[PDB]
Amino acid sequence: FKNLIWLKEVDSTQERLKEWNVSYGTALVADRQTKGRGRLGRKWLSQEGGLYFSFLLNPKEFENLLQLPLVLGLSVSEALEEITEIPFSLKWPNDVYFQEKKVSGVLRELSKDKLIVGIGINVNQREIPEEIKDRATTLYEITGKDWDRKEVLLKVLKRISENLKKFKEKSFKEFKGKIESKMLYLGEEVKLLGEGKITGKLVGLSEKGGALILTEEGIKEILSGEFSLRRS
Ligand SMILES: Nc1ncnc2c1ncn2[C@@H]1O[C@H](COP(=O)(O)OP(=O)(O)OP(=O)(O)O)[C@@H](O)[C@H]1O
Ligand SMILES: O=C(O)CCCC[C@@H]1SC[C@@H]2NC(=O)N[C@@H]21
């Protein structure tokens, strides 16, 4: 990742890459989004000062069930930690948190032989909406200073490219350990909802990238990426 397409304002970098045929190793960046979407059509507030970009991957190269989102999440957290010198956490299966507030969201979509990844990073948002204020923060709120969005973008893209290359010729074993230790709510009571309901203690992560939940009837391995993890 080195070549960038930088737009001032657009409906959604995800939507744009659905209509436009871009080559691999190219990231579409937008300063603002009017129709920013989440993992289920939810509104993703994208005001000025934030980082919003999408890129394409080969659906025949990466298995995007659970492993991919975890590696992408690891990548962004590794980049942010190197720049801000602040520790970050990973929410299974696809989000980057600081303490209890979300700082970055990772999204993957498939639209006709296309694997489209969309990452949103809160960096320099000055005014934060109350409806998300309780579960979201920015780099500016944490550190108390602004950060060069382009520099952060390049770092994130470098960590992604490196992690994915090592994910190709090798396996998820190279990341499993690192991710497990950074998992949010590790060893705490949690609840999983969405296409079922499993409750227990988050005891760790499996080799397949599945969540290990200790229930009253033993440890269950959750292999579905539709489950939302909440604190319980
Ligand atoms: N710029 C932003 N930064 C952080 N959070 C945002 C931003 N814009 C929207 N959100 C919130 O993120 C939510 C979408 O995230 P999503 O619903 O995919 O999380 P989830 O994984 O389902 O829930 P959980 O994080 O509890 O597992 C929206 O409900 C919205 O309130
Ligand atoms: O947390 C989530 O639910 C995923 C959020 C993904 C947001 C990014 S920001 C750029 C790209 N375009 C979008 O409409 N969403 C992704």
Automatic annotation (TrEMBL):
Residues 1-168 form the BPL/LPL catalytic domain. Keywords: ATP-binding, Biotin, Ligase, Nucleotide-binding. Gene3D superfamilies: 2.30.30.100, Bira Bifunctional Protein, Domain 2. Biotin binds at residues 12-13, 33, 37, 102. ATP binds at residues 39, 42, 44-45, 102, 122, 228. One of its GO terms (molecular function) is ATP binding. Coiled coil: none annotated. It comes from the Bacteria. Its EC number is 6.3.4.15. This is biotin--[biotin carboxyl-carrier protein] ligase. The gene is birA.
